[PDB]
Amino acid sequence: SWEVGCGAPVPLVKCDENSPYRTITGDCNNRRSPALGAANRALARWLPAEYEDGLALPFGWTQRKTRNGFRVPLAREVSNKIVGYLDEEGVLDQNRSLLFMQWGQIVDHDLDFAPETELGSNEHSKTQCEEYCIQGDNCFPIMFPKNDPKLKTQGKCMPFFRAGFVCPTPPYQSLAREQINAVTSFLDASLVYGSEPSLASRLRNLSSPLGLMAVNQEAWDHGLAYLPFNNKKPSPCEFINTTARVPCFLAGDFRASEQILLATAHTLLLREHNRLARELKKLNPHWNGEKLYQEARKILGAFIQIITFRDYLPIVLGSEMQKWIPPYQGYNNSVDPRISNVFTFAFRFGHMEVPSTVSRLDENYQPWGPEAELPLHTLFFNTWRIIKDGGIDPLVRGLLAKKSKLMNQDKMVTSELRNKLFQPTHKIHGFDLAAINLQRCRDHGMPGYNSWRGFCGLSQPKTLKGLQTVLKNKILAKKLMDLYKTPDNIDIWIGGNAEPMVERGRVGPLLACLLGRQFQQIRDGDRFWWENPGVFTEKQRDSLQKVSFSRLICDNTHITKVPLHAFQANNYPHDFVDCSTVDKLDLSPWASREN
Ligand code: HEM
Ligand SMILES: *[C@@H]1O[C@H](CO)[C@@H](O[C@@H]2O[C@H](CO)[C@@H](O)[C@H](O)[C@H]2NC(C)=O)[C@H](O)[C@H]1NC(C)=O
Ligand SMILES: *[C@@H]1O[C@H](CO)[C@@H](O)[C@H](O)[C@H]1NC(C)=O
Ligand SMILES: *[C@@H]1O[C@H](CO)[C@@H](O)[C@H](O)[C@H]1NC(C)=O
Ligand SMILES: *[C@@H]1O[C@H](CO)[C@@H](O)[C@H](O)[C@H]1NC(C)=O
Ligand SMILES: [Ca+2]
Structure with a gap:
């Protein structure tokens, strides 16, 4: 295709790579190509995009237009027929x-x-997309199949706006449309x-030279910090309980208040920041604000990388972990650390893990109050249940002692997200995330299931019998074939997630390959990876090796009983131990000196 590089922002670079700290945007991580892995650039394409028109139109857009000689089924039709239970x-x-x-969601x-x-x-607009369900430009409405009960009760469609794309915003041709990754591709506590x-x-809290992140000024959690409120209008967290008028939280990522357990997780991380900036000052009273904030933020980024790579990924990828992510051998500047477009769909395997309710548990890990257990849907954009209904301790206890949903070929996504x-x-409260994932897959120009099977070196079933054998599920393969007509046409989100899980893992072979390749790239391709010689000292690394999610909980909450392995299913009190027994992070190794 030989051609030069376009880009939405300016590849305006000011690197001068001597500072020991990451930029906010991700720029300058890669010296030879300073934009690589930086926010607000195109997602990487591991395979060329596939659109209806070769350029920008999703499959499903022109109803005459087939994919490989068949009409693509409606995203909501696939949802109801396959994803529902x-x-x-x-x-x-x-x-x-x-x-x-x-x-996973973090x-x-x-x-x-x-x-x-x-x-x-x-x-910006006062949208007609929701109004009248007229597809056009960036409005790509998810239409209901007849028989869809939502037709009786909600009208003809669900709103769906196409994702933004680079060399921008309204019209373009002759280079296929590329969607934007708005955050840093690095695993960097962005x-x-x-x-x-x-x-x-x-x-940040710049009013004091302490290098602290700003905390809520209206509300405290038994003397401990909350995220600042976001004073932007309109607020969906206000929209959900007008009486309570509790806004959304302000966090490094805009989705933090999407559900109460995510806002919870964000609250712990921030707490850890300030706990970190406080300790560094004790050990280094000479250190200035900017300093305390960077060094804390750098420790926090290391904790997220290690928790993800040491604890999470091995119990997602199982026996495939070593295959795609071998033990680390330093920074490789030849590796592309950009997040691919496909990964953004691959990582939506988490949707099948979200259970239908969320609980609040007390000190004895028994139900907290009379409405301890809540249906997940009442907890979208819900921060009042945090501020006015007990703080984060009871919700954190539920994270520990309640279970994820297991993916299941006959019970894929809970109705709390699906309807x-x-x-x-x-x-x-009437949208369907599953139909959204599938409309999005098309929006983003995704190659189909077999193109991805091919990329990962896996067989590409062409018939019903071949697909039944790949899925190890006769009835599911038959439902897919009936909707799609060929496995070439199955959207990657629903084809990857339909495969049975690998051994000791929670995704199948195809997803383990897409996820595995991405993660190995974000680690090997990151100049600031915690384990890269130079980034931390030998002593600091030995200290950072003791971090666990159990110890984070202990330090930033009033919970004194934690399990040693927080991701495994744990029952109170058998698998729970005193906080005192858990390894501490030791910042002694960060002591420095002048005069
Ligand atoms: C109750 C919990 C959750 C809710 C309410 C939720 C909701 C959403 C929504 C509304 C989207 C945007 C869909 C779109 O317009 O295409 C999204 C996307 C996404 N979700 Fe979730 N989700 C949840 C849990 C998870 C989990 C557990 C994971 C992973 C383990 C996950 C991973 C992703 C990823 C990777 C994306 C695409 C982000 C991007 O690149 O744009 N989500 N989710
Ligand atoms: C909106 O939030 C308020 C809390 O601010 C909820 O009202 C509380 O409900 C129980 C009922 O016994 C009481 O303990 C509180 O005193 C009530 N608080 C106030 C300030 O009135 C209310 O249930 C929420 N409403 C909805 C529809 O979600
Ligand atoms: C900033 O830090 C100061 C000094 O410790 C604290 O008292 C104040 O509440 C903080 N302000 C914000 C907005 O976080
Ligand atoms: C629970 O999962 C962990 C990690 O996946 C594994 O090491 C352990 O054996 C599991 N427990 C059981 C009973 O399977
Ligand atoms: C760096 O990554 C490239 C491309 O993925 C690979 O070919 C090369 O073997 C890697 N470098 C080293 C030293 O292994
Ligand atoms: Ca990041």
Whole structure:
């Protein structure tokens, strides 16, 4: 294709690579190519994009237009027929805690965000897309099949706006459309600090030379910090309980208040920041603000990388972990650390892990109050349940002692997300994330299931019998064939997630390959990887090796009983130990001296 590089922002670079700290945007991580892995650039394409028209139109757009000689089925039709289930009994993952699902969503948010069009500044259209369901331009409505009960009750469609794309915003041709990753591709705590200099400074507390992140000024959690409120209008966290008028939180990533356990996880991370900036000052009273903030933020980034790579990834990828992510051998500047477009769909395996309810537990890990257990859908954009209904301790206890949902070929996504999703500005608890993932897959120009099977070196089933054997499920392969007509045409989100899970893992072979390749790249390709010689000292690394999610909980909450392995399914009190017994992070090794 030989051609030069376009880009939405300026590849305006000011590197001068002597500082020991990461930039906010990700620029300057790679010396030879300073934009690589930086926020607000195109997602990487591991395979060329496939659109209806070769350029920008998703499959499904022109109803005459086939993919490989067949019409693509409606995203909501696939949803109802394949992804849906009624019976929440028996659905829980007997060996993953709810926190395993939660960490997944955290790591995701650190790595990719491809926001719907007009990532811009403020107050834009007054949308007819929701109004009349007329497809056009960036409005790509998810239409209901007849028989869809939502037709009786919600009208003809669900709103869906196409994702923004680089060399921008309204019209373009002859290079295929590329979607934007709005956050840093590096696993770098960008969800805590921001990926733009503008949000990064606003989250900081600069009124005191202490290098602290700003905390809520209206509310405290038994003397401990909350995230600042976001004073932006309109607020969906206000929209959900007008009486309570509790806004969303302000965090390094804009989605932090999407559900209460994510806002919870963000609250712990920030707490850890300030706990970190406080300790460094004790050991180095000479150190200035900017210093304390960088060194804390750098320790926090290391904790997220290690928790993700040491604890999470091996229990996602199972026997495939070593295959795609071998033990580390230093920084390789030849590796592309950019998040691919496909990964952004691959990592949506988490949707199948979200159970239908969230609980609050007390000190004895028994139900907290009379409405301890809540249906997940009442907890989208919900921060009042945190501020006015007990702080984060009871929710953190539930993360520890309640379980993730297990993926299940006959019970894929809970109705709490499949039929009751709330999206900002759309006023009801009646959306379907599954249909959204599938409309999005098409929006982003995804190659189909077999192109990805091919990329990963796996067989590419062409018939029903071949697909039944790959899925090890006769009836599911038959439902897919009936909708799709060929396995060439199955959207990657639903084809990857349909494969049975690998041994000791929670995704199948195809996803383990896509996820595995991405993660290995974000580690090997990151100049600031905690274990890269030079980034930390030998003593600091020995100290950082003792971090666990159990110890983070202990330090930043009033919980005194934690399990040693927080991602496994744990029951109180057998698997729970005193906080005192858990390894501490030791900042002694960060002591430095002048005069
Ligand atoms: C109750 C919990 C969750 C809710 C309410 C939720 C909701 C959403 C929504 C509304 C989107 C945007 C869909 C679009 O417009 O295409 C999204 C995308 C996404 N989700 Fe979740 N989700 C949850 C849990 C998870 C989990 C557990 C994971 C991973 C383990 C996950 C990973 C992802 C990723 C990677 C994306 C794409 C981000 C991007 O690149 O744009 N989510 N989710
Ligand atoms: C909106 O939030 C308020 C809390 O601010 C909820 O009202 C509370 O409900 C229980 C009922 O016994 C009481 O303990 C509180 O005193 C109520 N608080 C106030 C300030 O009125 C209310 O349930 C929420 N409403 C909805 C629809 O979600
Ligand atoms: C900033 O830090 C000061 C000094 O410790 C603290 O008292 C104040 O509440 C903080 N302000 C914000 C907005 O976090
Ligand atoms: C629970 O999962 C962990 C990691 O996946 C594994 O090491 C352990 O054996 C599991 N427990 C059981 C009973 O399978
Ligand atoms: C660096 O990555 C490239 C491309 O992925 C690979 O070919 C090469 O073997 C890696 N470097 C080393 C030293 O292994
Ligand atoms: Ca990041």
